Amino acid sequence: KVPVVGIVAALLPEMGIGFQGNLPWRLAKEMKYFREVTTLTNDNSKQNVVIMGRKTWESIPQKFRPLPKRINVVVSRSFDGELRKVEDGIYHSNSLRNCLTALQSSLANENKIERIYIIGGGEIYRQSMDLADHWLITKIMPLPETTIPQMDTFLQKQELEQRFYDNSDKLVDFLPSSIQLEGRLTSQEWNGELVKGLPVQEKGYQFYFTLYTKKLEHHHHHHHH
Ligand SMILES: NC(=O)C1=CN([C@@H]2O[C@H](COP(=O)(O)OP(=O)(O)OC[C@H]3O[C@@H](n4cnc5c(N)ncnc54)[C@H](OP(=O)(O)O)[C@@H]3O)[C@@H](O)[C@H]2O)C=CC1
Numbered sequence: 001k002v003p004v005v006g007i008v009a010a011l012l013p014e015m016g017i018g019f020q021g022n023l024p025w026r027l028a029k030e031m032k033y034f035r036e037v038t039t040l041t042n043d044n045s046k047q048n049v050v051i052m053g054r055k056t057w058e059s060i061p062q063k064f065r066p067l068p069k070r071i072n073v074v075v076s077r078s079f080d081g082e083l084r085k086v087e088d089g090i091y092h093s094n095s096l097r098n099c100l101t102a103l104q105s106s107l108a109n110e111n112k113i114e115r116i117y118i119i120g121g122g123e124i125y126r127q128s129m130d131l132a133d134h135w136l137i138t139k140i141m142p143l144p145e146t147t148i149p150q151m152d153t154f155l156q157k158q159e160l161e162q163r164f165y166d167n168s169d170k171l172v173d174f175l176p177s178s179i180q181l182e183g184r185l186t187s188q189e190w191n192g193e194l195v196k197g198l199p200v201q202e203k204g205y206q207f208y209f210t211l212y213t214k215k216l217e218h219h220h221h222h223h224h225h
Pocket residue numbers: 007008009010016017018019020021022023024052053054055056057059075076077078093094095096097119120121122123124125127153
């Protein structure tokens with residue numbers, strides 16, 4: 001019952017997110033959004049968790065890891081079990097799924113996690129479509145003059161739009177209430193797709209903060225004793 005939220009910056013239309021182990025852009029404003037969203041809580045006595053794969057961990061500059069003021073979890077199949085403190089601010093897990101179950105125990109967590117953010121990378125996100133309750137996706141578009149950057153890692157847009165709908169009308173309300181956003185909400189056609197969310201521009205790019213929410217489910221089975 002703590003929300004699990006995938007958070008990702010992706011280039012349209014392919015939803016590219018990475019190239020040779022690194023982000024394909026450096027956008028200070030996007031990074032500020034990610035920082036504030038994953039750090040900030042509505043309740044001052046809680047922190048959020050950020051969960052990431054080993055390769056993503058290794059790409060964060062050494063001065064900036066672990067990410068401050070958030071519980072960091074790194075997942076590697078070569079680690080020891082399902083959630084182990086290895087250093088201040090650092091947990092290792094050998095299982096994305098079992099670490100989420102572990103993080104959800106109110107006995108372990110004392111109800112002092114607000115949200116669990118899944119912060120990448122590709123392999124991790126592949127596995128999170130059936131785990132996340134919401135996705136915060138920054139939809140990035142090169143302006144007409146901008147060279148499209150090369151990329152090698154992609155968000156699974158098909159599987160996204162299967163399970164989730166664009167709930168960006170509720171993005172403002174979904175974010176911790178102290179964040180301040182520059183744009184107003186905004187529906188724009190771009191290459192035949194509808195892009196809705198909160199606009200910024202930086203460097204060669206325009207980008208929208210968007211929110212995706214699980215679609216309604218039929219009631220097929222509830223488990224009884
Ligand atoms: N634009 C964006 O918002 C973001 C983009 N990225 C990008 O993504 C790319 C990195 O993605 P990718 O290469 O797929 O790597 P990941 O960051 O997803 O790491 C993959 C590694 O995580 C571990 N892992 C994966 N699944 C599990 C599991 N179920 N249980 C335990 N461990 C698991 C394995 O570690 P091991 O090999 O040790 O066993 C695996 O090799 C980079 O280009 C990066 O820049 C990353 C974050 C955000």
